[PDB]
Amino acid sequence: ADLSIILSKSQLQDTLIHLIKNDSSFLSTLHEVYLQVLTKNKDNHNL
Protein backbone atom coordinates (compact mmCIF):
# COMPACT_ATOMS: atom_id res chain seq x y z
CA ALA A 1 0.00 0.00 0.00
CA ASP A 2 3.03 2.37 -0.58
CA LEU A 3 1.58 5.63 -2.01
CA SER A 4 3.49 8.80 -2.96
CA ILE A 5 2.10 12.12 -4.00
CA ILE A 6 3.63 15.18 -5.61
CA LEU A 7 3.44 18.55 -3.84
CA SER A 8 3.71 21.78 -5.78
CA LYS A 9 6.31 24.28 -4.53
CA SER A 10 3.67 26.27 -2.55
CA GLN A 11 2.25 23.08 -1.05
CA LEU A 12 5.83 22.00 -0.16
CA GLN A 13 6.39 25.38 1.57
CA ASP A 14 3.16 24.94 3.66
CA THR A 15 3.78 21.29 4.51
CA LEU A 16 7.42 21.78 5.60
CA ILE A 17 6.36 24.68 7.80
CA HIS A 18 3.69 22.55 9.39
CA LEU A 19 6.14 19.74 10.02
CA ILE A 20 8.94 21.83 11.47
CA LYS A 21 6.59 23.93 13.57
CA ASN A 22 4.35 20.99 14.86
CA ASP A 23 5.92 17.56 14.36
CA SER A 24 8.46 17.35 17.17
CA SER A 25 9.54 13.87 16.07
CA PHE A 26 10.25 15.19 12.56
CA LEU A 27 12.30 18.08 14.03
CA SER A 28 14.24 15.75 16.49
CA THR A 29 15.30 13.62 13.56
CA LEU A 30 16.61 16.70 11.61
CA HIS A 31 18.43 18.04 14.68
CA GLU A 32 19.99 14.70 15.66
CA VAL A 33 21.36 14.36 12.12
CA TYR A 34 22.48 18.01 12.11
CA LEU A 35 24.40 17.38 15.36
CA GLN A 36 25.98 14.29 13.91
CA VAL A 37 27.20 16.10 10.82
CA LEU A 38 28.71 19.06 12.78
CA THR A 39 30.59 16.96 15.37
CA LYS A 40 31.88 14.56 12.71
CA ASN A 41 33.06 17.30 10.31
CA LYS A 42 34.68 19.73 12.81
CA ASP A 43 38.24 20.35 11.68
CA ASN A 44 40.89 19.77 14.32
CA HIS A 45 42.43 23.18 13.65
CA ASN A 46 41.35 26.54 12.29
CA LEU A 47 43.52 29.34 10.91
Binding site for its own copies (CB under 8 A): 1-9, 11-21, 23-31, 33-35, 37-38, 41-43, 46
Q: In angstroms, rounded to a whole number, what is the distance separating the alpha carbons of residues 34 and 37?
A: 5
Q: Smallest distance, Å, CB 46 to its own copies?
A: 6
Q: Smallest distance, Å, CB 28 to its own copies?
A: 4
Q: Smallest distance, Å, CB 44 to its own copies?
A: 10
